Design a protein around this ligand. Structure first.
Ligand SMILES: [Cl-]
Ligand SMILES: [Cl-]
Ligand SMILES: [Cl-]
Ligand SMILES: [Cl-]
Ligand SMILES: [Cl-]
Ligand SMILES: [Cl-]
Ligand SMILES: [Cl-]
Ligand SMILES: [Cl-]
Ligand SMILES: [Cl-]
Ligand SMILES: [Cl-]
Ligand SMILES: [Cl-]
Ligand SMILES: [Cl-]
Ligand SMILES: [Cl-]
Ligand SMILES: [Cl-]
Lengths: 458, 459
């Protein structure tokens, strides 16, 4: 009865996916040619390993493709991913084939190649598109440091950083709720590298990252009633004319004043040609003389998107020191995203982290829980679906205030069809509600699953 | 109208294929990510290049996939070859999609993956399987040094070496022809003392000549039979190297020959010992004098060195011949090296690039595309030409071979007329759409054969 998932590729994405999925209700097999890496994973987690080339029939067979419920293709190459989905489909009829695709040349023919059945991938996960769209999303919500997405698209969290003199600091959460009885509440707080469970007694301090629940169509409204929506950004500076930076420039250049700095001379000329309303410089990312010549002191958002984490961090730190109001950096790993952001560096984004979020939108734990895009050390936000009527459930027909939750766990909101309800103690759960929670420690996710399990499961 | 061929991959096979395919009537485009190799090839041959990843849609469009007559996928990986064929099929409807596939794991499922239409590769080229079958082919033609086919397997060519006391030495070709009066064959090429010579009626065969016979594949074995080659079959075979080729070959030979196999890796040798129930399997070095002596290397009929290292193959073959193995054969990666290696102490050298190229040429020739290939040791260049046009639109159609002015050093071996194979005579009259298989001593006249056969307006 546990769902069977095969993950092809033991890289950072494949391994982190396995970490978030393994449990009594999801059985994991991971495939790679690096035996040292497989051994490490099998020590950490309860899963099966197969050493071999991910798209070979014998390797897929040994990994259990004939009986698997999902295949996740996150190997080194787009072509091995596509081959593996094809071979698995043809020889084993494996359902739910999902692939990471990095090459924009394939993504330009999405419909013709991947929706027609020519290459039989059910879902494509395109890291560079996800990162570009995510940065654009932050830019449209001036003042926001993070927007949290769920499988259930209609609800979001938005985070703002509390500051000396700001409208949030020094207030208890219970008092917050009485000053403004807004369609929001605090879903989570992070303070000095630690998650903080929101309580009535919780007092917001300077430098807290405070996450607010909001319907996805209501983000501006909430930020505005919180007094935390800023005026639109105007001057954007991008460092790195690679795929992400060039695509971002194109999308921003008509409404913002964009400047872009590319280190490679040949690339810089091509982009100068191609980006008609962006001013392109050939120069180094962390050149003081250039940044002052280009009025870095007036930049609203400095966005460092090179291939090198170090260059991005150092150029953003410099940009911040020189008076850019906000800085954002591309970093490879999500473990590092926790470490880098929240101080001098306003926003850190990982293509790997974005890929994992998208993958988690397509796979549920126990058919109940989707893990959201907020995952920081042990803490994360999730949503859970409440299946069954009151006689087939432990939570349907109960009030939020009577539900006994695991430690460090809070319910922030409920999605009921189309409606987003902010949770209160008297809120009664209804059949097929999606319940949004924050957990300080994800080891209690299995306890959420068990709680929401309907009778027919037993 | 030019035939448009896309070669995906500027590796050794792609570059060689480009050479076999030079001609006025062939417009070649090569795709690869290595700019320097593309410039190299573009300097050397008249062809177009595209710098990019071979399975990308835009790259395929830039190479002319929407209009190509053939797509040859010989990149670095199986997975790129399979993706390129699918992409070209779906977006550009490109015909004649031919792919190299090295993994036995895909080839074990060809029917399900490829022939079903799921992965739209029209023809798989499996180098390891082709090398194994080629070696087997030589073993089943004892005395043969090369076996080639032409015209969708209707014509065959076999090289033998004339020896004192045998039926060839001291006779003229005109005489030999008539000592096999019912069996139609002719000498296509001869290699004598380091050089090709033109076979003529008056040519007298000498000891140590390599002599190439051409005949219908339906009769070629009766040719070998008349040449007394089948009177002493091989009996004792020793293989060195238990990789995919060596292990497949031992499996195929072990019930009809007495086979010993030497594999260096202990784990693999244990596996093979179990798997190959009629082969004697040793774990040892390929070039160990002591082992070879214990195992009677001096009574070995054919010693076949199939390791994954060329220098080991060469060294072990040289040592075996020195120690008295009657014939030795070596696997060599690089095609150019093959002829350097063979013809003295090493009787035959085989490469997977060569086998891959021969397979590709069967498809090229079937599609009526201008083509040349070199025989063993440069004995001749081999061309299959098509006689396009009627008598007013051709320089050859309706004329007798005897009245065609062929360039120097040229021998017409066979004509293929629908299903009929005719071993050519001066009296044979060429007909429209005949395939003519010919042999040239000097490759400089290859362009002249193309000009002789091209249809009007003769250019
Ligand atoms: Cl295991
Ligand atoms: Cl504040
Ligand atoms: Cl909004
Ligand atoms: Cl990535
Ligand atoms: Cl993550
Ligand atoms: Cl549902
Ligand atoms: Cl060109
Ligand atoms: Cl299919
Ligand atoms: Cl003879
Ligand atoms: Cl003759
Ligand atoms: Cl002579
Ligand atoms: Cl025999
Ligand atoms: Cl020699
Ligand atoms: Cl005509």
């Amino acid at each position: 009865n546990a769902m069977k998932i095969i993950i092809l590729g033991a890289g950072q994405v494949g391994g982190t996916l396995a970490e978030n999925l393994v449990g009594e209700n999801n059985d994991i097999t991971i495939v790679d040619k690096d035996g040292d890496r497989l051994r490490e994973l099998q020590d950490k987690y309860d899963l099966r390993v197969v050493n071999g080339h991910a798209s070979h029939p014998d390797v897929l067979h040994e990994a259990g493709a004939q009986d698997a419920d999902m295949l996740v293709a996150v190997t080194n190459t787009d072509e091995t991913n596509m081959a593996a989905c094809q071979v698995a489909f043809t020889l084993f009829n494996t359902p739910n084939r999902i692939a990471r695709i990095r090459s924009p040349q394939y993504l330009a023919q999405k419909e013709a190649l991947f929706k027609s059945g020519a290459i039989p991938v059910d879902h494509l996960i395109a890291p560079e598109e996800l990162v570009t769209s995510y940065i654009e999303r932050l830019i449209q919500y001036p003042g926001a440091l993070q927007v949290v997405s769920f499988a259930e698209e209609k609800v979001s969290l938005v985070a703002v950083k509390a500051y000396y003199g700001g409208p949030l600091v020094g207030n208890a959460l219970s008092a917050l709720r009485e000053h403004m009885p807004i369609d929001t509440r605090v879903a989570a707080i992070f303070r000095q590298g630690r998650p903080i469970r929101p309580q009535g007694t919780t007092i917001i301090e300077a430098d807290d990252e405070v996450f607010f629940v909001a319907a996805s169509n209501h983000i501006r409204s909430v930020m505005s009633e919180l007094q935390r929506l800023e005026k639109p950004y105007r001057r954007i500076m991008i460092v790195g004319g690679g795929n992400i930076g060039a695509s971002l420039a194109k999308r921003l250049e008509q409404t913002y004043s964009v400047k872009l700095i590319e280190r490679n001379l040949q690339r810089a000329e091509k982009l100068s040609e191609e980006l008609e309303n962006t001013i392109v410089f050939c120069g180094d990312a962390a050149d003081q003389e250039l940044l002052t010549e280009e009025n870095i002191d007036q930049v609203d958002v400095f966005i460092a998107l090179t291939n090198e984490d170090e260059t991005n961090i150092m150029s953003a730190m410099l940009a911040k020191r020189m008076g850019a109001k906000k800085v954002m950096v591309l970093i490879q790993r999500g473990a590092y995203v926790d470490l880098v952001q929240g101080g001098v560096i306003d926003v850190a984004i990982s293509p790997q982290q974005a890929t994992i979020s998208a993958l988690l939108t397509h796979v549920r734990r126990a058919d109940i829980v989707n893990v959201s895009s907020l995952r920081r050390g042990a803490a994360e936000a999730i949503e859970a679906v409440a299946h069954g009527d009151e006689s087939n459930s432990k939570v349907v027909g109960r009030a939020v205030g009577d539900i006994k939750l695991p430690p460090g766990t809070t319910i922030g909101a409920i999605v009921r069809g189309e409606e987003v309800l902010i949770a209160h103690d008297r809120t009664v759960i209804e059949q097929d509600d999606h319940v949004v929670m924050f957990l300080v420690d994800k080891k209690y996710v299995p306890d959420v699953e068990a709680l929401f399990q309907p009778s027919p499961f037993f």
